C-alpha cells in the first residue's frame, strides 16, 4: 500500500496531489503492532525451551 501510495502520488492523483504525504498517524502505530507481535513471540518460544 506504500507501493500504491508512492505510485499514485507519482501520478499526481486525478485532482488531489498534496504538498503533504505525511504518513499515518495510525500507520506509524500499525508499525508498533508489528513489534508487539514480535515481543509476544519471543517470550512464548522462551516458554517452549523450558
Amino acid at each position: 500500500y506504500t507501493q500504491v501510495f508512492q505510485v499514485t502520488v507519482s501520478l499526481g492523483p486525478e485532482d488531489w496531489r498534496p504538498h503533504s504525504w505525511d504518513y499515518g498517524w495510525s500507520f506509524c502505530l500499525a508499525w508498533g503492532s508489528f513489534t508487539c507481535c514480535m515481543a509476544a513471540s519471543v517470550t512464548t518460544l522462551n516458554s517452549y525451551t523450558k
Partner: peptide
Amino acid sequence: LSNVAGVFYILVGGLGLAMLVALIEFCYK
C-alpha cells in the same frame, strides 16, 4: 522505494521456505 520492494517477494519467499523446511522436519521428528 519501488526498486527495493520487489525484492521483498523473494524475501518473504524465503520466509515461506523458512516454514516449509521446518514443517517437514516435524516429519523427521
